[PDB]
Every structure is written in structure tokens, then in C-alpha cells.
Amino acid sequence: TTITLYEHDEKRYRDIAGDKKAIQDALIKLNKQFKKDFKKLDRSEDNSDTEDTIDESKGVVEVYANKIKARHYVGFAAVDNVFLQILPKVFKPKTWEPILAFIRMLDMAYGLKIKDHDLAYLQGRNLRPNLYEVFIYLFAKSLWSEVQRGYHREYVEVHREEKFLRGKLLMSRQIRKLPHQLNTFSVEVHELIEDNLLNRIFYASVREALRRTTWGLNRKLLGELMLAFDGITPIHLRTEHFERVHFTRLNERFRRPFELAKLLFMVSGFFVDMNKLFERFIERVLVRNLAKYRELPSSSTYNQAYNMDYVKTGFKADKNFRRSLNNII
Amino acid sequence: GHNIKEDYFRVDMLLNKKGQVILYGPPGTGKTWIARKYVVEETNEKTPGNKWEFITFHQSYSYEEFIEGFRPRTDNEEKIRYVVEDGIFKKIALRALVKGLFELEDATIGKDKIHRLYILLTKKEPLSPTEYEEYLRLKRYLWELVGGLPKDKLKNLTPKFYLIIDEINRGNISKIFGELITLLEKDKRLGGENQLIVRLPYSGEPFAVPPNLYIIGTMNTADRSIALLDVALRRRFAFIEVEPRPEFLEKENLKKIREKKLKTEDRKRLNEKLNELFSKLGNDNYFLKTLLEKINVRITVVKDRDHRIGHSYFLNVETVEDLHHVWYYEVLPLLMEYFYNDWETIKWVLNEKGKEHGNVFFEKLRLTGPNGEEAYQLKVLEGDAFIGALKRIIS
Amino acid sequence: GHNIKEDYFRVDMLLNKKGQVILYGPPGTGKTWIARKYVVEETNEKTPGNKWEFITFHQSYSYEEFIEGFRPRTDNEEKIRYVVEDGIFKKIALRALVKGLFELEDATIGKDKIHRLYILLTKKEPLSPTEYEEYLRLKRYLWELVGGLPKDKLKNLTPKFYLIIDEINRGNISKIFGELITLLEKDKRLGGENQLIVRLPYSGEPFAVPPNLYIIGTMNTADRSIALLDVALRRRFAFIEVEPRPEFLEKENLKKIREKKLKTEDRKRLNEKLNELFSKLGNDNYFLKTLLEKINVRITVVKDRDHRIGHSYFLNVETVEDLHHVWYYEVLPLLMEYFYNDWETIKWVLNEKGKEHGNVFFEKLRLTGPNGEEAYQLKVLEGDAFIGALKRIIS
Amino acid sequence: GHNIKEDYFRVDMLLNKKGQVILYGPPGTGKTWIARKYVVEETNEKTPGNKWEFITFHQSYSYEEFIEGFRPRTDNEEKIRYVVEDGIFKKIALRALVKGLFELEDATIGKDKIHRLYILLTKKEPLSPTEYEEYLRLKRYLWELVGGLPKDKLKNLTPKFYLIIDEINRGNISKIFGELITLLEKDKRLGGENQLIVRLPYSGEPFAVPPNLYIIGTMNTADRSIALLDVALRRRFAFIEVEPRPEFLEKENLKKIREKKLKTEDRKRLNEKLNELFSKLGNDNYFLKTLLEKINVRITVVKDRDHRIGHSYFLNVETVEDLHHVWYYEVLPLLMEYFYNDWETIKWVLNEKGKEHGNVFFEKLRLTGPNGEEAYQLKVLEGDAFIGALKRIIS
Amino acid sequence: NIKEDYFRVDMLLNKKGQVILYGPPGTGKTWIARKYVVEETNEKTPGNKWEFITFHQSYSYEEFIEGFRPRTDNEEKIRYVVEDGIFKKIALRALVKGLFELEDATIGKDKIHRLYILLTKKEPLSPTEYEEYLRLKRYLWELVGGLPKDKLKNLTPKFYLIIDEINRGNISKIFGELITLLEKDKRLGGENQLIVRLPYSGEPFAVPPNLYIIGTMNTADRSIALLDVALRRRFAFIEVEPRPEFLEKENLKKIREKKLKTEDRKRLNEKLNELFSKLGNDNYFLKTLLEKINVRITVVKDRDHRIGHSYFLNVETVEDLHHVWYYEVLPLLMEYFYNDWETIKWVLNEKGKEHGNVFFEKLRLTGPNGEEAYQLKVLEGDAFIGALKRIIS
Ligand SMILES: Nc1nc2c(ncn2[C@@H]2O[C@H](COP(=O)(O)OP(=O)(O)OP(O)(O)=S)[C@@H](O)[C@H]2O)c(=O)[nH]1
Ligand SMILES: Nc1nc2c(ncn2[C@@H]2O[C@H](COP(=O)(O)OP(=O)(O)OP(O)(O)=S)[C@@H](O)[C@H]2O)c(=O)[nH]1
Ligand SMILES: Nc1nc2c(ncn2[C@@H]2O[C@H](COP(=O)(O)OP(=O)(O)OP(O)(O)=S)[C@@H](O)[C@H]2O)c(=O)[nH]1
Ligand SMILES: Nc1nc2c(ncn2[C@@H]2O[C@H](COP(=O)(O)OP(=O)(O)O)[C@@H](O)[C@H]2O)c(=O)[nH]1
Ligand SMILES: [Mg+2]
Ligand SMILES: [Mg+2]
Ligand SMILES: [Mg+2]
Ligand SMILES: [Mg+2]
């Protein structure tokens, strides 16, 4: 059951065509999982203090016996056949325009490099509006564009007993061989291997993505990524795995799929507070045109003190702020 | 035999243009069979070794087994020695050049040295150290003669030689084709307009591909991603798509293939079984044609065209239990492999998407997990249940 | 012309200014062709072995077969003998240096020892163990000879030597060029402003690159995994871009390229074949020019500029059936590797976006998936339907 | 304060403080140049040999070619000996110690045994077998003498020896510097307060670095895949940053750098070549100074500080055509690999970001993609249009 | 804490048999390892009662315990003998010398002394002496195997093996049987004494209690971090932390006046009186410089990447302090936080200070996506000392 919510919207269980309890206790195991991961989640005067506040069904959503009221935490959530997404109510209309505004919000504020032509490709594909399947697509398209541009291979120094002399003959190991051991060479080789730790992360991210994706567009994109990572060893994606990748000239072109693979993989789903999503927004806005999130710098749209207009639903919004910058400066 | 003499014609015309072709397509389309039958037709030799060779690339296959490498050999007193053994491409490229230098009626080719080099290239036991040094000496004479020989005679090397590289995408082709990225191109061969003689690292010897050597590769395009080939290496080969041909799976076309190699008293005994098989399929002579076309279009929509099911599995089907074998051991494991056990996608390919717990190929388990997970299980249907489920795919 | 003289002139100018160039670009743009054409015209030698060498880098090139390394050799008095053998670069650099000391007029230079070292460097046989010790002796004589030579003498070494390294990015270049990242700089060569002589690890011998030696690399840019991203190694080379030139595929430019190898009446055979070819393309002499330039700028937008189709795909066509085989077996399978299962983009490259049926290269399959996904079937066009679908691309 | 005065003083002061120094920075800033200028001026030796050695690290140096390893040693064709041979560091650390023991007036130092060990260490040919065990006999005597010799006599060895390790981060230094992580510190050397004499694994011999042997390393900071992350190994070395100095590209600085090594009449043609260069740049004497420092401050912002363009790219520029060839075949190819298909960054480093057409290096293609993707095209500007676009980067 | 850290290595060597000194680079791990052993053995040079080796990744089992080695002596064939590694050569030296002062009547001291001078030969062994050395090795362990456990528990001379940079080698590959053998109860004469036979020779081998191992280990390299928990049980792990209190003016005086002449001290005391006067007459300037940077490194990184006090230990003038800062410390911090300018300015306490007398001057140009970069500013004189006073305040 896919739940599409804005912040502080309430839809009852009778409103969503699903089950009366399977929609409940799925995300109950997520907002308690959000209570477990609450200390690493960043807040900027959001006034939560959830040491025991989120334990009383007050995590990313309110689990009432009648309805589900959403909170300021925006993002997607996939648990136990129940998909949930919470969007900013700034972008709430009077069906794809609110989601891509939320993509381009955390593209230019959270520091990602989400291309606009990849978001323009999803429009007109008559798909269902889904935060998870958009980020599954953006990970899988950026990974498939990179693997097509070149398969990631690393050089590793291997000391092998080889039946053909490849690379550098290890002389002190070959000299100290008894004469019944002279049917192989002790060599040092620097070989282009494909089973890297970066490719093992990308393989286990494509495996976890087909386990939960529902678009045929993403499934076809991830299936050809699955055949690309065929000879790669399957791993389990720990947080220990994602820190052993260090980005140099060899693999910095695989950084855009990696920051998307880290955003999805590490009950799972990304959530940022919209209070601090607006904090990191305007500090990247005030510095190139030259923070309370309630209705009453604040946000201004067709549904919603310097007001910030939103033409980002589909860069001339900051030109209207010059009339506000003429008084502020 | 009208359709075999045009797939021969695609291979024959493009081998004259590019020097080397790749037959690509899904597994089971007859790519290894077309490549082998073209070469036994062109080179009138049923066995590899003289004017053609058969090699299969695998993940562990290397440049050193293909071109040359330092290799531990033994003496005639079986003491170990490290020599540079020529690989299978270099042994047949030198064979194609030296046999091509036989028929050249030139007054500068030392035919006694060239025929002795041919014997050491066609010797199949490993060379004695007293004839390995003769083999290095005659190769040293060969590239001395070839380098001072004009393109008018080097481009007309008459006996064509062939190298079938089966499963060529299963190896790291750029690593295995070390100098062969440059050398295989038709301009870069001997007698070519931009003829290139390379120096090989291990032996230190000159090397070039002769023009009468041809390489037919076969690529199963569902066993390795075709978007992982090198674009520059792709420029060397003509790429011939060998697609599944379910028109071979009609009753008259099944008879026209299986009666080219067996006797007449076995022919109509095979024909009465094919008439017995197709009678149980609703007396539809185009049943296996329609069954393979319907699942391959359904595969092409939700997967690649490269992951289609080939026609060669159903080609030796003459009973219902032969069709029951091919479906449950060549089709259904192959569909589960291609779709990574996505039961909802396979059941749409098998035209049974909103249909479980019945006469289906994938029954749903009645138990659900704690996370709401549903599992599907392959159901073996026999008799009228199997034929009625194959008719559900067509309908 | 820009290729008749000027692309030759870019190689000659940047090879004297820098000492080594790398010709980079898409596949089939003429990087290997102009590297071979320049060096054969400079050395006046069609074949390598003397005054120039041709090698191709790959993943089983090492430092040990390029510069020097312990390689096992076998004799009759001794079974296994590990010997530091100089690689192909140390052979071509010492050959350039020793031949450069032939024509120097110093009385310090012992001409008999230098001429004996040239015989052991240009020896086609492997070195005898009594000659390898003479070879090690004459090398250590030379490296104390050129160490006491004036750098005004050492820099004007007269006969230029050329190492063409095709597919230079297919090897681990910094691993292959071990001491050569230092030594290949133009003023760090012999007689340079800051002349450097390294110590080699295996032989323990001094080594320097002469100014007599030039490297012409040809690297491929379509594969980004083997992209030359070593910023310090890039400083040693001049990077000449060899772009796809669609203006070679004009009718008046096609014949004057293709008739330089044709002598008396095969030029007339080529002329009326190109007359027949371009009459069937609507009398557009710039048809194949417009076909390449419209496809390549469409490839440049949705994929990189390094994935452009080189002009060598279409440079050998003479009929509309040669264009048909280049299209359906070389060009269109390459675009299907580029835009793999990405049908809306490859139809935009072929200027048929939104045209689902008709005389189109990719016909839409009538079946849609369960999630609404869609596939396109490759339609093989022929005749004016093929030429009319090619006119849709160019306009 | 230029290199020969101030950066010479920096290398000299930190070598006496640390024993070993790494010159780091972007490529082409003069790290190998000032390592070679320092050591040639210190030793009064243009060529490596006795008092200094030049080596270049790569991944095919191991512990065995640097310190010690097992090697074949053939006295004759029949007899082969498998001995431990000293690597290039151990050959020069024992050379620095034995020559340092020439000039001590101590009574316990047997001078004829020390002088005989110096002949066996500086012998150009490989040693005879009857003198190889003499070389091992005297090395065992040397570590019984050293080791019993007081620390005040041992710490001032007067001939300073130098090992320039070019490209020091290109080798696995912790693998190559086995036992040299400990011994290279200035107080852990011979005569130091914490003097350590390690035991070597292959030979079993005692070993210690003498105080009069110095190491100068160069490394480019741009390649971070070989960045020196071993911060314990960083403690041994003083790290001198050799930054790009665009002030060398001022017209009077560019003159007197290249007026250093020319002939009599060959330096009155270079300054008038440099007159017409800067007259065509608009009489801005700081044109290439401001061109480099504006590009380097822009690369610092978007890429990093360590990927700045070194001044050696523009240091041999004498004409505008020389500047055009440096721009279009060295700089802008390198800049297109920094920001590969990141077109808004590469046009920001040239500050042509809003400039989509006209006299720009990257003109926008008029065609946009099917989803709005946009590409650019490299435009080769010539004449004053090249200078006017290059003067735009300044302004 | 030079006597206490001496007593701490002493108490934990006599408790475990082997110790690893671990910590950041430049803390004195190799120094206190050598200083302990040249004072216990009273030998300045290794070779007799102690050995100094350094592990690296080219170090193996065959050069540490035993391995096959070709040996063509002068004319004869290439015999393939089992060459003893440095641990076996020091364990047999520790045992045989220990048995030479043992008073058991079953110990034949003529064969023990003959085995001792064959273990202390600097020259390689003769092929006839190699068979004699193998006979005495078989005599030794059939004598050791028959000796009582109370006599083998107290063998007289202590032997020491200093393994510098022990984590740079593959220790479990290098310590083949020594994972089992080096445990204190499984040492020779121990309560669970175990004599294991060796693979390449078929010869028994235990570790005597005379032997002590002192490892030094850099902990700032996590790629060679010693994570074998079973191997950690063999060793006591002594942390040698950075000591900024060594960089106080009177502690920098007392450290540097021990290896110096009596009338060479006034060339040092007048140099340190002139150093710390230029630091504002603060005797604890370099102390609180190191401890404030090392606290700030501990926050934004690990504690194992702290600056060692050996960087500033030889600082005598403010130009020596300038050369330690700009060629050792600032290249180290620029590698700790590579293109992390807000972290490296926070460690140097210059977070908001973009321009002025700072080590990192801000670049006036901003990128298209708001990128900001910094240039290294080389300060001189009191502008350099004033910028170091900001990190201590
Ligand atoms: N006359 C002429 N022929 C050319 C030119 N460019 C390419 N060709 C022809 O096309 C063929 C292919 O060129 P080639 O040099 O091999 O491409 P490439 O740059 O090496 O492409 P790659 O796949 O190896 S990476 C050559 O044999 C040559 O005959 C040209 O500019 N002039
Ligand atoms: N006169 C003079 N010449 C210089 C100076 N810096 C560089 N050069 C010239 O530029 C060339 C490049 O200098 P080099 O020492 O090789 O730079 P590098 O830092 O080592 O470059 P790298 O790629 O190997 S990492 C030198 O050969 C030298 O001729 C300098 O400061 N003064
Ligand atoms: N007097 C005195 N000197 C010390 C002390 N600690 C370190 N030093 C000096 O600093 C130098 C470096 O110490 P060292 O032992 O090599 O550090 P380390 O811990 O081994 O550093 P690394 O090898 O991991 S990089 C030594 O030579 C020693 O002289 C100390 O506590 N007292
Ligand atoms: N007679 C005949 N046999 C075929 C044909 N196609 C396939 N086969 C047979 O099918 C079997 C397996 O086909 P194979 O070539 O190995 O499949 P592929 O290599 O994956 O394309 C072979 O033994 C062939 O004899 C055909 O067109 N005619
Ligand atoms: Mg096959
Ligand atoms: Mg080529
Ligand atoms: Mg350098
Ligand atoms: Mg240490």
C-alpha cells in the first residue's frame, strides 16, 4: 500500500485501499526504528526532543486508531508491503509536480548532483509518483550510465603461483623453490580486477533495489545492471562497507551513484526534517542572488519576513527576491 | 535449405569485408552450430587443427594461452624448462601465413624453410628443444621474408583459415586480444593498405595477422552484458544477430530439420511421433512456433531481446514428455535465471499473472511472512495440465 | 589539406616540441592510421624492426617486458637461467642512442665498441650467454661514455627513432612507464637542459632516453575506465585530438581518399561505383557527410563526445548495399550498445522519436508490459525504404 | 629569492634537519628540477654514480631491488650461484658509510680493509666469485667496526651522499622501505643518539643508514590514488611544497630563465621572440603570469589545490603559436579530463560560463536532447580570436 | 614518567613474555623499546643478547622461523638447506645460553657451547658444520624435553627481540606456530609448556622464557591495524600517548642535555631561553600548543592520529619551530583533512578567520556551486608566533 502524504495531512485507514492493521503496524516498526536512529538525524530547532516522545507513536507519523497524521520529517518509507512518502506542504497543490519540486529542493540544498534531464525523463512516462522509485531510478540510471561509459576496475597487487609468467617474477620466492616446485612461477601481478569493494557495493545495492522496486522502468534498468555485475561477489551492505571507498581519479566518476546508493542503503527509508531542510536551503540561496517553516525567511507557494517564491515546481524565482534585496541591502 | 544458405551468406560476405565477425544472440539460436557448419562448408575438413581451430573463451582464459607466454615445458629427458609457447591464435595465424606462402609462386620465398616451418606449426605434440630452436629460427626467417615482401602478393594468400571463438564474451576479450585489437583490422593485416607488423612482448618477435585468417565469434548475449564490450574492439567485428527462429518449430519445419541426418525407416517412425505430439497440442502445427513467439515478445517487453528463449531446445522435441523436459529443465530455469526469481514478471511472461493455486507453472505458497512476503513455488504439471497451461500462454 | 598535410603537421611539430605525442579520440578516426603514416614517411621504412617499432599495450604488458626484468632463459649446459632481459623500450632507446653515436664525430666515442653494441641490439636471434656478457659490457661502456659526453653533442642525434604505442591506455601506463615518467620529458633526455640518467632496478644499469627517440601513442577515449587520468603522466605528452571527420565522406573526398591506392582503371571502377552510390542517395554528395555529422552531434548530446562514430565505418562503402551492411551489422548494433534498452534515445539519435511504425529502424511492439513498460523491435529496411529512413536522420 | 638561492636553502636546511626530504606539489612545478639542481651543485657531479644516485619509484620496485633480495649469479655457463644482492639503497648506504670511514682518523678503523670494500662497492662490473665472498668478508668486518666505533666519530662523515627518488609515491613505499621506516630518522642513523643497527631478513646481516646519506623525494600531489597516506612515514621526511609559480611567466622572468643556458647569438633571438610574443598579447608583460594564476585559483576552487597547472607548461612558450599549441594540446586536454563532461565547470575555469557562442573555447551545440540535455563543442580559436578569448580569462 | 614507563614495559614483559608499544607516530615507541633493551642487556649494539628487526609486507615466515634456501658454497652442487629465521636464531640463542648457566648434570656443556658458537657465527655455516648444527639441535631438544620444568623456568640471561613496526607485517603469517608458542604458559618451562615441531625441518621448537618480544606499532594506519583478537591475547598493549609536557621549557631542557657535553649545555640553554622569550615568556607554549592541537585532532578524527611530541622535541629557535610547523605539521594536517578546509581551520582555531595572520588565507573567488577554497599562507616572525598563540588560546 503506497501512502502519499504531505506534512500534517491526515488520511484514515478507511480512505486508503489496503488493510486495517497491515498499514498500521508496518510503519509502527518504522517510527520506532526512526526513534532508534533519531540521534543521528539532524534537527535545527524542530522541537522534538524524542528520547521518549517518538516512542508514543510520534516518530515520522502519528499512529492514531482512526487516522495517520504526518510530521515535519519529509522523505520516503518502505516497510512490510506499505510504502510511505511525506512531502512538504509548501509544494502541495490546490501529480508529479510536487515530487520533483521536493527532488530539486534537496538537489540544490542537500548537495546532490541530480540531473534535470533525468527528472525530465520521468515526466511523461505515465508512472506513479513515488519518492523511492525516483531515487531508485536516479541511482540506477547514474550507475548504468557510468558502467556503460566504463566498467569500474581496480589494480590490486597479487602474489600468485602462476603457470604463465605474468607481470614481475618474484625472484626471492622463485630462487628459494625446491627443484620439484619449478612447474609454476612466483609472480607479482597488478591486474585489473572487477570484483572491487566499490563494485561489490554497487552489486549489493542493485540486488536490494530489485527486491523492492515496482516500476518496470527501474526493473529493466536494474536488470541490465544485474547482468553487468555478474561475476561480482555478493556482500551484505554494512556501514563498514560504505566507508572503505575512497574517491580518487580512479573512481570519482562513480561518486554520484555511490552517494545515491548510500542514501538508500546502509525497514528502510530516507527522512530529513523539513525545518532543517529549509535551514540548509536558504543559505545556498542568499549567496548567489546577491528560518521558520510555518505559514505566517519563510516559504511561499500557491498553497502557502522575506517570502521565498517557488517556480522550482517545474531560476527566475530569485529575480523576484531582488525587490526584497533592494530593501535588505 | 534456403534459410541456411543466406545465413551462410551473411557470414561469408561480412568475413570478406571485416575479416572477423561475431554471431550474437540469446543462447539456443544455433550460433555455435552456424559458425561450425559454415567453416566445415568452407574449409572441407570436419575436424579442427589443419585449416581451422575451435577455441572457447572463459573467465580464466588469458593472453598467454591465446598469443604467447612463458610456459614451463619439459625436455626429452623431462627436465623442466621455461620457453615462450605460442598460443592458439599465433599458431593458426602463423599457419595461415606459412600455408599462404606455399602457393605464392615467388622466387624469393624459401619453400624448404617455409615447408619445415609448416610441419612444426602443424606438429601437435609439444616441440623438442632441438626443434623448438628450429621453430624460433624459421619464424625469424619468416618475418624477415614477410617484411621485405610486397602487398601485391601478401594480400592474395589463397587458403582461408578460420578461428571459431565460442563464448567470446565470456572472456576478457581486450586482455586476451592483446595486440589483436590493432592487428585484426582488414587494413592492418598483411598485404593491407595500412599493414602493421607488431612486436610481441614475451618473445620479442614480429607478428601480424595474415589476410586469409578469419575469426567467427559467438556471443550468448544473455550470459554477458553486451553493453560491456569495448567500442573500439566492436569496430573490428561485423555483428550478425542470430535471433530465435520459432518458424523452425512448426511441424513441417521440425520434420525438415530432423530428417537430414537419419534413415528413411527411422524417418516415418519419427514422423508418427511428431504427428502424435502435435495431435495432443490441439492439432496446431504452429503450436511451438506460437508458443516461442509469444513468450519471446513477452520477454522482449519486460527484459531485453537478448534474453529471449532460443529455438534449439524445442528442436529435438518429438513427444509430450520431450516438451515436458524442455519446458521444465531448459525454459523455466532459464526464465527464473533471466528474471532473478521475480515471480510476478515470469507469470506475466507465462500469461498466468493473476492466476495462482491452479494449473500454473508457479503456484503461490498459502503462507505469508511476517513482513507480508509472498513466495511462489514451481508446480510440475503433467498430462493435460501441462498442455492446458501451454495453451494458456498462446491464448 | 587539413589531413593531407596539416594533421601530419600537428604530429611532426608536437613531436619535436614535446618528444612524445598521444593521438586520442573516438574509434575509427585515424589515430593508428596517421601514426603509421607519419612514421613510415619519416623513417622511409614500411616495416618495423629498424628505426621504428610498433607495439600495442594491453593488460599483460608489464614493466618487465617494456624496460627490463628477470626473464627465464634456457641453454643446453644449464636448464633454468634467470636473466635481466631488456624490454622493447630499452631496446629501442639504446638502438636510438647507439645509432646516434655512429655519426657523432668524437674521438672519445670508441666506434668499434659502439658498432659492436649495435649488432647485439639489432640481433634478431636471442643473445648467447657469452654474447649477453659482451652486451652487458658494452652497455656499461656506453653509459660511462655518454656520462662524460658534452650535452651539445648528445642532443643532435641524427637518425630519428619512433616507438608507436597503439592502444597505449589499455596498459597500466604508469606501471609500464616505470622510470619513463621522469625520463621522457624533452629536457630530461640526453643532451637536455636537465639531463637525467636513472638507475634501473634489475640490471643495476644506468639508463636515459635519447633525444633521438619519439613516442606516438594512440589511445581510445570511448572507454572511460582506461582514461588517461594520470595528471603528471599527461604532462609528458602532447594530446592531439583526432576527431571524426564527416567531410571525408563527401563524394569528391571519398574518391580522392580511396583512389590513392588504386592505379589505372580500378580508379574508373571506383568512380562509377561512387557515382552509382550517390545517385541512389538523391544526388546528395554530402549525404554520408550529413549522416555522420547529424548522428555524431546527436551522440554528443545524450552520450559523450568520445562516443562519436568515426568516419572509418563509412569510409569503405561503394554501394548502397555496402552502406546497408555497414548500417545493420556495424553502426546500428553499436548504437544498440550505446543506448542499450533505451529506445526513446536511440530513436532520437536516428531522428525517429515518436514515429513508432512505418519505414522506421525500430518498430514499436504492440504489446505493453504489466507495469506499462514498452519495447521496440529492430526492423531491417532495404532499398529506398532504407535510404528514405536514412534521409530522415540527416534532416 | 628564487630556486637556486631560496628553495636551494630550503632543501639544504631540511636535509640537515631530517636526513630526507619530499618535494611535493602539482605536476610541472620543478620538483625533479630542484632535486637535480641541488644534488649536482652539492656533489659537483653532473652524472649519477659514486656520490649520488637518481632512481624513480614505480610499482615494480620491491624490497628486493632496493634493500636486498635473492638473485642469480653466474660465474660461468655451468656454475650458477644464488646469492643475496644489495639493492640500490644498500649499495649507496654502504657506499656512503665506507667512504665516510675513509676520513676518520680513528685507530680501530683498518684503512686498507675499508679502502678495499670501497673498490668492491664502486666496481662497475659484477664482482668475481673469489671477491664476492671478500665483499661479504669486508661487510661483516664493517659491521663489527661500526657498532664498536663511538658515536661522536660516527656522526660526522664528510662526503655527503644523495639518493634522489623521483616519483616516490608511485611505489609502495612501506613495501620498498622495509627496515627503512626505522633507520631513516636522523637520530636512528649512525652516530645518532638512538642509533639502531637493524638485522636484514634475507642475508641476516646488520644494517644501518649512515648520517652522510640523504634522500630527496619528489611526488605530484594531483594523483591521490598514490597519495602518501602513511603518516608514520611522513614523520621521517620534511615536506617542501613546490607550488606553481606563475611569476616565472612574467616577460622579464621568462627571458632570464631561458637566457641561462643558450649561446652568444642564440640569446638575442629568444628575447626578440619574447618581444613579439608579449607584443601580440597586448604589451602585458604579466600576461601568462595572470593567465596561470587566474586558472590556478579557479582550479583550486572547483577541483582542488593540488591539481593546479604547473608553470612548466608555459615555460618554453616563445611565440603565440607556441602558446596556442600549449593551450590546445596540453592545457585544455588536461582541463577536459579534470571536468570530463562537466561543461559548466570547464567554462567557469575559463570564465566563459554564460558565454555560449562566439569567441569561446567551448561553443554550445544548437541541438538539445529529448529530455533537455545539452552538450558543448570544442572550438579551435586562432590568431587574435585565440588571444581575445585568452585575455577574457584574465579579465 | 621515564622510570615508570620503563617499569611498565618491565612489569608486562615479565608477565606476558611479549609486549606491543602502540600509539600515534612520534611518541617514543621505538625509543623506549631500544632504551629498555640497551639498558637491560647493557649492550649498545644488537646481535648478542638482543636483535632489532623491522616488519614489513615483504617479511614472511621463511625469514622469521625457518625456510628452504639454496646454498652453493664454492664448487659443489646447490644444496637446499633449511635456513633458520631470526626468531629461531634468537630463541635457540636464548635457550642454549640459558642452558649454559643451568646446573643440570644431564646438560653436556661441551655440546651446548658448540651449539652456541654455531648459533653466533656471523659467517654462513659450512655444509659439514650445517650437519653438526643439526645434530646439536636434535641433542638440544631431546635434552630440553628431558629437563624438569622448574629448571627451565629460570634461565639466566634475558634475550630481547625488538620488532619495530610490527603491524606492517602480516603477523599471523609471519608468526606461524608462534601464535600458540609465544603464550607465557606455553613458553618453555611454563605450566602448560608445549614443544611444537616445525614444518620445513621436522625439528621440535618451543620458545624459551629468556626471550622477550617488544613490538612497536603505529595506530594511525587503520589498514594495518592489529585486529587479530587471538594474536592480541599474546601481547600486553602499552599505549605510548603524546606527551606535550615534554615540550615545556624545563622538560625540553632536561631531555636534550643528557647526550650533550657539559659546556655544550650553555649553547642549548641560551638557545631555549631565547626561544621561549620570543613565545611571550611562556614556558609551557609548546606544551599547550601540542595538547590543544591533539585535543582538536581527537575530536574531528581519532585519537591515534594525534601529533607526537617528537616533532617539536628538537625545536631550539623560532625558525626551527617555523620549519617544523610548515614542513612537518601543516603538510600532515593537510593530509589528515584533505580539502576539508573548515576542519583544518577548526584544528588551528581559525574557523571564522578568513583573512589576516592565519595559516589559510581565503580565496576571494567563489565557485559556481558556492565552492570556497583556501591558499596556504606562510607567516614569519611574530605573525607566525601570534598565529600559534591563537591555537593555544
Ligand atoms: N586516407 C585516410 N584513411 C583513413 C583516415 N582515417 C581513418 N582512415 C582509415 O580507416 C581505418 C581505421 O583507422 P584507424 O587508425 O585504425 O582508427 P583508430 O583511430 O585506430 O580507431 P581505434 O578503433 O583503433 S581506437 C584505417 O585503416 C585507415 O585506412 C584518414 O584520415 N585518411
Ligand atoms: N629554470 C627553471 N626551470 C624550471 C623550473 N621549474 C620547472 N622548470 C622546467 O620545467 C621542467 C619541469 O620541471 P620538473 O622538475 O620535471 O617538474 P615536476 O614537478 O617534477 O613535474 P612532475 O610531472 O614530474 S611531478 C623542468 O625540466 C625544468 O626545465 C624552475 O623553477 N626554474
Ligand atoms: N629523551 C626522550 N626522547 C624521546 C622521547 N620520546 C621520543 N623521543 C625522541 O623522538 C624520536 C622519535 O621517537 P620514536 O621512538 O622513533 O617514535 P615512534 O613512536 O616510534 O614513532 P613511529 O616510529 O611510530 S613513526 C626518538 O629518536 C627519540 O630520540 C622521550 O620520551 N624522551
Ligand atoms: N540442424 C540444425 N540444428 C540446429 C539449428 N540451430 C540449432 N541447432 C542445434 O542445436 C544445438 C545447440 O545449439 P547451439 O549452437 O549450441 O546454440 P547456441 O550456440 O547458443 O546458439 C546444436 O547441437 C545444433 O545442432 C539449425 O538451424 N539447424
Ligand atoms: Mg554456443
Ligand atoms: Mg587503432
Ligand atoms: Mg617530477
Ligand atoms: Mg618506529
Numbering used by the authors:
A (entry chain G): 5 to 98, 109 to 280, 291 to 314, 355 to 360, 399 to 406, 427 to 436, 439 to 453
B (entry chain F), C (entry chain E), D (entry chain D): 191 to 585
E (entry chain C): 193 to 585
Original paper wording:
McrBC is a two-component MDRS that in Escherichia coli (Ec) restricts phage DNA and foreign DNA containing methylated cytosines. EcMcrB consists of an N-terminal DNA-binding domain that targets fully or hemi-methylated RMC sites (where R is a purine base and MC is a 4-methyl-, 5-methyl-, or 5-hydroxymethyl-cytosine), and a C-terminal AAA+ (extended ATPases Associated with various cellular Activities) domain that hydrolyzes GTP and oligomerizes into hexamers. Biochemical data suggest that stimulated GTP hydrolysis powers DNA translocation, allowing EcMcrBC complexes bound to distant RMC sites to interact and induce cleavage on both strands. Here, we present cryo-EM structures of an McrB hexamer and McrBC complexes from the evolutionarily distant archaeal species Thermococcus gammatolerans (Tg) and the well-characterized E. coli system.
